[PDB]
Amino acid sequence: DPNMYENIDIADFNVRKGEDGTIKYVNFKLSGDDADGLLCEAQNPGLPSNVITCGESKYRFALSSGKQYEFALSLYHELGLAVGFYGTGEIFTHCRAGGLGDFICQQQNPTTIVIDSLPDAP
Ligand SMILES: [Ca+2]
Ligand SMILES: [Cl-]
């Protein structure tokens, strides 16, 4: 963690929720050591979602419920190694009306999530 890691910048994180609370769509732009404003997106991802690949890249993500904020992101980067980079962070969102009952919950400030080759802290 302190020495071998990758800073992932998340921007424009956006989630559309139905009146249901079901996730209709999730969208964000990822920047890292090998990405600049890479689109990560999913329609009907589930909560928690499966691991989803960003475009054609070696970056992937999963969406889950946070503990401080509503949404948490898990991020993955395949390195061509037997181990990969992984990390999780919560993203503050402000929710607005999305039309016909929907919510659109939107990140207000870019945030950084650190990923590395260690698993989750206990
Ligand atoms: Ca990690
Ligand atoms: Cl971790």
Swiss-Prot record:
Q: Which UniProt keywords are listed?
A: Disulfide bond, Hypersensitive response elicitation, Secreted, Signal
Q: Which residues form the AA1-like domain?
A: 3-118
Gene Ontology cellular-component annotations? extracellular region
Subunit comment for this entry? Monomer. Interacts with Arabidopsis thaliana NRP.
What this protein is reported to do is described as: Effector protein. Elicits a hypersensitive response (HR) in tobacco plants (N.tabacum) and cotton (G.hirsutum). Boosts systemic acquired resistance (SAR) to tobacco mosaic virus (TMV) infection in N.tabacum and to V.dhaliae infection in primed cotton seedlings.
Identify this protein by name: Effector protein PevD1
Disulphide bridges, residue numbers? 40-54, 95-105
Recorded source organism is Verticillium dahliae (Verticillium wilt)
Q: Please state what the annotation says regarding this protein's domains.
A: The N-terminal region (1-98) is sufficient for induction of SAR of N.tabacum to TMV infection. The C-terminal region (99-155) is sufficient for eliciting HR in N.tabacum.
Q: Where in the cell is it found?
A: Secreted
GO BP term, pick one: symbiont-mediated perturbation of host programmed cell death
The main location class comes to secreted
Which gene name belongs to this protein? Answer: PevD1
Instruction: Give the organism's phylogenetic lineage.
Output: Eukaryota, Fungi, Dikarya, Ascomycota, Pezizomycotina
Question: Does this UniProt record's set of keywords contain Magnesium?
Answer: no
